Symmetry: C5
Subunit: 78 residues, 5 copies
């Protein structure tokens, strides 16, 4: 839980599979999770858990603000 990023401002069509492939460019990714509504539907953010800590500052610089389906993601850390 020290190598995890918060990716907000996600467009409705962004899936976990898309973010994994995107953040994998910053290093091996253990898993991605878009939390689902209390009644099943995705929320508009994901948690991206890297294997290595260095992927965190690398991923932020590399991908912060990148547009997915027109909407720029917002990366935060802790």
């Amino acid at each position: 839980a020290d190598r995890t990023l918060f990716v907000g401002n996600l467009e409705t069509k962004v899936t976990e599979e898309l973010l994994f492939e995107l953040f994998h460019q910053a290093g091996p990714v253990i898993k991605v999770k878009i939390p689902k509504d209390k009644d099943g539907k995705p929320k508009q953010f994901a948690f991206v858990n890297f294997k290595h800590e260095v992927s965190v500052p690398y991923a932020m610089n590399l991908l912060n603000g990148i547009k997915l389906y027109g909407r720029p993601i917002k990366i935060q850390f802790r």
Copy 2:
């Protein structure tokens, strides 16, 4: 089968000289393209927009980031996923 739609982009603000062949080669850089269509007038003219159908849906968010706003004969295209 009709999604097909999940893999289609609306490309607007097309210069009249842009051909279906050009868009194909252009959007092929984002992945395999199944078909491209520039709808036709009742006088055969272009309506200044097209539909690009990719094979994989990952190409969709990729083509957008990579081509949206690119100028074709001076006119910047406008890519929309559903339009």
Copy 3:
């Protein structure tokens, strides 16, 4: 005459030669010829015509090279 594989390149610095433009635009595909017309007194003018072998080079070249600075002066590409 169906040679619309040709671009106009205005706003040329005095030191831009046909050789330079050929080499510069060759990055967008084979070039048949480049021309800088000379004026009434044998002096080159401030624009050029670049004729491509393939039409696809035109939209490519426009997007790739337009507004690039040669000797500090940005070229102004036009189709017709």
Copy 4:
């Protein structure tokens, strides 16, 4: 010496608390071999919000300065300054 070490050392300020000497070594290594990196701690402590990066080759100094100045580490851009 220790002035030939002063002309091969850069001051890197506006650091995020999370930035470690290791991260900086790897980052500035992209501008050439790095002898040593030091984030000073004071009195307690503590530690400080800047770093000293000592290159082996003086050429790395203007290179790194022009290559890495202003890039964001954990959202905070680093401030490189030569002597």
Copy 5:
């Protein structure tokens, strides 16, 4: 045969820029004959340089590629003669 068409003026130099640094930097535009940072009448380096390329094409290439680049925080100002 005094070719100034293959030489660039590089002004607004930081005092720590050397002829060796400008050589290696401008070499990225093609072979470089010589680089000169002139001296004043008292033998003190000036804050501009002359870069002589072997090929004229390096001129428009170099100044499009390197003009305004910061050396020790100071952007160089390239001018073609």
